[PDB]
Amino acid sequence: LSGAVTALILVIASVIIALVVVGFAFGLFGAFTGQG
Amino acid sequence: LSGAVTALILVIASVIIALVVVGFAFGLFGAFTGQGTVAQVGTATLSASTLTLTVTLKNTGASTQVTGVLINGNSGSVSGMTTISAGVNTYTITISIGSISTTLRGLVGSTISLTLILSNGETVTVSAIVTS
Amino acid sequence: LSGAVTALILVIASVIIALVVVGFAFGLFGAFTGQGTVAQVGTATLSASTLTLTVTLKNTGASTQVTGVLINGNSGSVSGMTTISAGVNTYTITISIGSISTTLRGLVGSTISLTLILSNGETVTVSAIVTS
Amino acid sequence: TVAQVGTATLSASTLTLTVTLKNTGASTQVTGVLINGNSGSVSGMTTISAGVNTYTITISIGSISTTLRGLVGSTISLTLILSNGETVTVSAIVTS
Amino acid sequence: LSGAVTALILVIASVIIALVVVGFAFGLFGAFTGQGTVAQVGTATLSASTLTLTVTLKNTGASTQVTGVLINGNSGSVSGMTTISAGVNTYTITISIGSISTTLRGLVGSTISLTLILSNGETVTVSAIVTS
Amino acid sequence: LSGAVTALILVIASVIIALVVVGFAFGLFGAFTGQGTVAQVGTATLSASTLTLTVTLKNTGASTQVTGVLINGNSGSVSGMTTISAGVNTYTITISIGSISTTLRGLVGSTISLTLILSNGETVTVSAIVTS
Amino acid sequence: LSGAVTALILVIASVIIALVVVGFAFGLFGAFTGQGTVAQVGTATLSASTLTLTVTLKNTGASTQVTGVLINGNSGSVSGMTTISAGVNTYTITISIGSISTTLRGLVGSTISLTLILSNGETVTVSAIVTS
DSSP: OHHHHHHHHHHHHHHHHHHHHHHHHHHHHHHHHTOO | OHHHHHHHHHHHHHHHHHHHHHHHHHHHHHHHHTSOOEEEOSOEEEESSSOEEEEEEEEOSSOEEEEEEEOSSOEEEEOSOOEEOSEEEEEEEEEEOTTTTTTGGGGTTOEEEEEEEETTSOEEEEEEEEEO | OHHHHHHHHHHHHHHHHHHHHHHHHHHHHHHHHTSOOEEEOSOEEEESSSOEEEEEEEEOSSOEEEEEEEOSSOEEEEOSOOEEOSEEEEEEEEEEOTTTTTTGGGGTTOEEEEEEEETTSOEEEEEEEEEO | OEEEOSOEEEESSSOEEEEEEEEOSSOEEEEEEEOSSOEEEEOSOOEEOSEEEEEEEEEEOTTTTTTGGGGTTOEEEEEEEETTSOEEEEEEEEEO | OHHHHHHHHHHHHHHHHHHHHHHHHHHHHHHHHTSOOEEEOSOEEEESSSOEEEEEEEEOSSOEEEEEEEOSSOEEEEOSOOEEOSEEEEEEEEEEOTTTTTTGGGGTTOEEEEEEEETTSOEEEEEEEEEO | OHHHHHHHHHHHHHHHHHHHHHHHHHHHHHHHHTSOOEEEOSOEEEESSSOEEEEEEEEOSSOEEEEEEEOSSOEEEEOSOOEEOSEEEEEEEEEEOTTTTTTGGGGTTOEEEEEEEETTSOEEEEEEEEEO | OHHHHHHHHHHHHHHHHHHHHHHHHHHHHHHHHTSOOEEEOSOEEEESSSOEEEEEEEEOSSOEEEEEEEOSSOEEEEOSOOEEOSEEEEEEEEEEOTTTTTTGGGGTTOEEEEEEEETTSOEEEEEEEEEO
8 A cells, every 4th residue: 555655656756757857957958048 | 253354345445445546646647747848940030120039849748838938138928829739830939029120130130149038937939140 | 162163264264365366367468468569570571652651560478459550740540551460570550640640751761760559569660661 | 265366347338247257165155246336136147167268247237237337448446245255356448 | 431431532532633643744745746746848038138037837837926037147036926836827027136237248149057946846947038 | 053153154165266366376487487587689681682580589588480571661471480499599580571671672781670579469669780 | 255354464464564564675775875985084195104094984874894095006905904994084995906006105295085995885085195
């Protein structure tokens, strides 16, 4: 019963982290395109 | 007698939860596969007098919007054809910035790089030719 | 005298219930092992004029169906060779969407990503080349 | 004592359940079945002899029919009601 | 006679406890699904003179706060628009650090990376352009 | 008295099931380690007149097959030396496509890229020189 | 009367076992966090005449050893300063290989890559400059 709870918690955390990393990469792209 | 009852209840609950988690993961896969992919498929044109950007964009995913643009000095708003449909289409987008206006008049014939901010959190790098 | 009678009745009932639970768990294991695993084993072809998807799919489990497809803009129905047999086979599936039609004519020669919704609750991500 | 000794098969088109059951006691009957939505009757091989045997049981429910056509390839859980007051939990694979 | 009484009492208690545990697990699932997901959806701007950060953040979960920020040298406090509502919004956050002030005047036009500490225990990595 | 009987039965069943799962996981590891790894270890030769591909392939896993090939325009079948043994060997494979024939006569001396579809679901990218 | 006695005994035993398992898991976490992390923090120097490796290594965990080294042709032993303390330190390690000796005399001024085998089962990749 605890295994699936841990699986869902880890899946949610992994999704959050992946979204954060992708957003940071795209922000890096925008910052580097118009740096001057 | 109660131990086996508890065992069966826990087994059923664990099966239900595992099925829910697996379904959610597959739904995540489907949602992320077709979230929307926007890229450039040709040289854009940035008018200096009218500050109008004509860019051909390719969308191989869900339909997104154009929340804003980032030009050399400042980031301004967009006021035309902000909906990006699926496929390859030419979009005529008007850019409104108080300061960047009239700065491109000395750049006619030069190349320029832009950034398009979309509603799906993705930034598209656009290369254009400054015209008049 | 009644206490030992109750003890034996409860012991027999507990044994029966435990055997039932164990058998159900092993049946669950057997059912989940061979539920059906569908993946892609080659590049697919997505015609733009006829909107026909030719994809090679591998099924290492039970035979499932194709309930629907998810392309860039909208999710449409499927009208051909929707049964996925075990092994590796080439399936010619026709996709019918009112809006996505004629949008792929400007994407000929490009790559595309699809999602296939199956009857076993599993989504398969498919990469294809847009042709004419 | 009736238990399951293997994965069962639940056809969607014919609504036929093929289940291997083990009986280590007296011979009982199958009074009914309990599927997801409704509980229906059984119309084949309802006598469960001693030992391990494969029983082909036909299930007749007015409403559950054609609902399993969208579940082909998925797993399912059933309950078998016996004449000795014991319920057997059965895990099966939905086929066509 | 007492054995079966004890058996029924234990069965009822086990059922109650199993239901409580299952309900708690499902409540945990619901709480963790919508705890709050904050990411960046565009390039931020970090003023050097006023030390003001203008960042567009996307929150697809519960509303959180901004407890602090982490810039190159030191971690400072935040004194504006610290509440992050659901959706995509632009937040103007003022950063107050004793030492990092005036250090960004030599970095005008360069790129910078920040970290935002939220009240839900999640750190958001932000890429910005240093302006004046 | 029945509670401890149920406890021991459940403990034994749980141990059996855990051992089965662990053994299955280790078998999965062994199967995935040696499933078959095919790569290119030299420049291939693609004849234009005979449409014959001579490619040196390295297989550091189980022996697979060549289900098909993907050349510029169309994907065709293969009719020679389709079995890929372990190690490094030179395979002479004949390609049969109705349309791609005679198209390579104008590409003699140029470089070309191919894709080989294997029976283990893996695609191998091959670079070749078009000859006559 | 015996059923509740068995229930309490089983509850106490289950609590004891669960506490033991939780404590073991947390001890595993503590042991794995500080097992020893060794990396390179600068260019190393590999003498050709004396076959002496001078490498700066950083250890942010427990103190490990150097069981052996792997150079281009053969893997040899190490005979100096094999203990890697915590922090950043410069280690002068003498390498003894029968065959690799005098092979580096023709590589003076070139770059080289090494591998260091540690007592904690971790291999460290080292880039060095061949000197005399």
